[PDB]
């Protein structure tokens, strides 16, 4: 053992609790998504590596039930992630956090991000020229927003929203509200 | 090796890398602040145990600069959080994330939370009679919102906002915007 690697673990934890809790930078948060994605098989492999050395019985019928639970829920959620990939053919359906997606037409193409709420009203704020909709920095936009965005969740929830009210604040900024006007089942 | 105490660690990591973002439940979000608060004077005293042993000075001298890194930001941040307390006599000035506060008058008293941005426009959404301003669930509210909310800083400035536009949606819900109209430096 050495009292240096533990220090680097304890230091990498503060940096994950501070900066990872933000979606306001694209190429900063997919890395955290990948880390959380990879943490799942490591735990199951560690747990199954304790039920084969079932000495003292504390490594026996305890490291078997939890192995079942953690190997069960992982499949139960991978199934849902693949089903979400089926409808919306996007590589965003494999994030280990949610199963709801938000689509925003911008600059010719469409920008897709994961969402956590699926509520009735969605707020949009343009600060200095950059758009920040739902805890997500979504690039560059003047007040030329879209009059219709969509939120998709596998098995129903093709919900179409609508620009209900927009306004301009001093010289660069503005706000807008999207009120859900249509629902679509699958 | 004891492969039963390691899976219990990765499971806790998967648990806290999943539910620690939401600031909605108060009695679930106050605990994360305490846990993150305790990690500084643990890392600080976990890097020092590599100067007690000091085996190889090419590997025992790294934890001198490293322990001089996190013994220096810790003071220069507690100092600032205490000043946030000094102006605003609140107990939210001691969370280890930000150094800006948000004040919302509600049901007679004031509801205070920590805020991270201090932008020019602030959004507010009422869903089913519950108010949600900046990632915090502030309680219960009809459309009886306030024409003035206040964002506070350590020494920076007091910044009063103003109800610029509100709209009722679906007999219970609503959207509102607070466009900054005033700024006051202490």
């Amino acid at each position: 053992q050495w009292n240096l690697v533990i220090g680097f673990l304890f230091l990498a934890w503060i940096m994950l609790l501070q900066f990872a809790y933000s979606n306001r930078n694209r190429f900063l948060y997919i890395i955290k998504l990948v880390f959380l994605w990879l943490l799942w098989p490591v735990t199951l492999a560690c747990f199954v590596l304790a039920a084969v050395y079932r000495i003292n019985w504390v490594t026996g019928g305890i490291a078997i039930a939890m192995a079942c639970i953690v190997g069960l829920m992982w499949l139960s959620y991978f199934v849902a992630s693949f089903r979400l990939f089926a409808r919306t053919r996007s590589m965003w359906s494999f994030n280990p956090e949610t199963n709801i997606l938000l689509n925003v037409p911008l600059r010719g193409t469409i920008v897709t991000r994961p969402l956590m709420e699926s509520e009735l009203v969605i707020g949009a704020v343009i600060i200095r020229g950059h758009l920040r909709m739902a805890g997500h920095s979504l690039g560059r936009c003047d007040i030329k927003d879209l009059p219709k965005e969509i939120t998709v969740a596998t098995s129903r929830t093709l919900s179409y929203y609508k620009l209900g009210a927009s306004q301009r604040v001093g010289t660069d900024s503005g706000f807008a509200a999207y009120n859900r006007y249509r629902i679509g089942n699958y | 090796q004891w492969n039963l105490v390691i899976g219990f660690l990765f499971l806790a990591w998967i648990m806290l890398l999943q539910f620690a973002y939401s600031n909605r439940n108060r009695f679930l979000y106050i605990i994360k602040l305490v846990f993150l608060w305790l990690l500084w004077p643990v890392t600080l005293a976990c890097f020092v145990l590599a100067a007690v042993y000091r085996i190889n000075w090419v590997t025992g001298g790294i934890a001198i600069a490293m322990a001089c890194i996190v013994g220096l930001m810790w003071l220069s941040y507690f100092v600032a959080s205490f000043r946030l307390f000094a102006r605003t006599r609140s107990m939210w000035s001691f969370n280890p994330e930000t150094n800006i506060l948000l004040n919302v008058p509600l049901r007679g008293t004031i509801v205070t939370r920590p805020l991270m941005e201090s932008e020019l426009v602030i959004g507010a959404v009422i869903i089913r009679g519950h108010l949600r301003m900046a990632g915090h669930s502030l309680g219960r509210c009809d459309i009886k919102d306030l024409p003035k909310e206040i964002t506070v800083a350590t020494s920076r400035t007091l910044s009063y906002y103003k109800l610029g536009a509100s709209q009722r949606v679906g007999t219970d819900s609503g959207f509102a915007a607070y466009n900054r109209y005033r700024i006051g430096n202490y």
Epitope: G108, L120, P147, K148, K162, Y181, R182 | G170, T171, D172
Partner: antibody, heavy 113, light 112 residues
Framework: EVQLQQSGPELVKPGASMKISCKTS????????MNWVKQSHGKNLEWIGL????????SYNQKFKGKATLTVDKSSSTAYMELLSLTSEDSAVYYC??????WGQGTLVTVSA | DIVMTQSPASLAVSLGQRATISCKAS??????????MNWYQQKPGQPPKLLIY???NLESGIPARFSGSGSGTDFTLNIHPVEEGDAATYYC?????????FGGGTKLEIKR
């Protein structure tokens, strides 16, 4: 600002097929959904179908299925409805809409010998 | 295949008086506690235009004289200060289910 120009009226015999072409302008062609309406003889609004110009993913009701094909040309910013096996009950004023706010001017389809 | 009906076939309303149109639905909608209903207006020779969405949300550009309300399976459109230009046919739409349906349409006539 936003325009949905129609191709104009046309007359065909029973059993014929045709293509209603709608040309849009004022905005980026993809990103907004397309809806079609029939408004048969009289004053009765109806829903035919809904399509996404960006990737397809069409949706119909159970009454107009097999009677129309909805497609898109991204190169001309155009949307098409193919009317199949037209009969005497198909003569109507068909037109496109986007988000229940903007409508085309109406294409008059007459089915008669 | 959700059916919606409007009670009056037509209205004869003098200037300055209130006009009312009612509609009933076979389904309660009740999606997350929110009802859905769209009110449309059409004039001769023109395509329709949207007036009210989600049972109470006034469309931008529509005067406040048009007030929509209701709940459950009962929906009502109120036009209080009826003027001489309010001569058109008004429609309802569910905007809730994949087989989207429209109402029959009620014609508004003005007395003189």
């Amino acid at each position: 600002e936003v325009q949905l120009q129609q191709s104009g009226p046309e007359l065909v015999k029973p059993g014929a097929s045709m293509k209603i072409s709608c040309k849009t302008s004022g905005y980026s062609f993809t990103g907004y959904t397309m809806n079609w309406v029939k408004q048969s003889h009289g004053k009765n609004l109806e829903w035919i179908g809904l399509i996404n110009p960006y990737n397809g993913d069409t949706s119909y009701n159970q009454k107009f299925k097999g009677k129309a094909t909805l497609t898109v040309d991204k190169s001309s910013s155009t949307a098409y409805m193919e009317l199949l096996s037209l009969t005497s009950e198909d003569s109507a004023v068909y037109y496109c809409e986007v988000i229940n706010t903007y409508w085309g001017q109406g294409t008059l389809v007459t089915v008669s010998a | 295949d959700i059916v919606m009906t409007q009670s009056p076939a037509s209205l004869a309303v003098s200037l300055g008086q209130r006009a009312t149109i009612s509609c009933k639905a076979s389904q309660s909608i009740d999606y997350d506690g929110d009802n859905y209903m769209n009110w449309y207006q059409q004039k001769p020779g023109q395509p329709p235009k949207l007036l009210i969405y989600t049972t109470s949300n006034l469309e931008s550009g529509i005067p406040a004289r048009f007030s929509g309300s209701g709940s459950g399976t009962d929906f009502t459109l109120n036009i209080h200060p009826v003027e001489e230009g309010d001569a058109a046919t008004y429609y309802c739409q569910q905007n809730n289910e994949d087989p989207y349906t429209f109402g029959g349409g009620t014609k508004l006539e003005i007395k003189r």
